């Protein structure tokens, strides 16, 4: 009934478009450690050594 009264053409507005997942290759070089969280607690002992 909802199809018929509105007619057919309207339904494109509710038959929602969905995203196809195209691939994403990346040249992920290693994540640089945070200076403050990672490097600095080791730096006091290792700097210049």
């Amino acid at each position: 009934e909802n199809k018929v009264v509105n007619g057919e053409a309207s339904e494109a507005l509710y038959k929602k478009k969905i995203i196809e997942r195209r691939a994403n290759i990346k040249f992920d070089f290693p994540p640089l450690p945070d200076w403050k969280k990672d490097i600095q607690p080791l730096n006091d002992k290792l700097k210049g050594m």
């Binding site: 640089l32 200076w35 490097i39 080791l42 290792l46 700097k47």
Partner: protein, 49 residues
């Protein structure tokens, strides 16, 4: 009778031997290079080269 052995250590321990400026400059270079690499890689891949 050839025994062989090797020991690897995490890169943070190396970064902890630098100063913050030298570290950040290295960050800069590896970041710029990464973009270039990602680009080249796609180009060669798409063209089988």
């Amino acid at each position: 009778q050839k025994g062989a052995q090797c020991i690897g250590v995490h890169p943070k321990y190396l970064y902890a031997t630098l100063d913050e400026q030298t570290y950040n400059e290295y960050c800069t270079k590896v970041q710029a290079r990464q973009k270039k690499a990602y680009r080249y890689f796609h180009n060669g891949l798409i063209n089988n080269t």
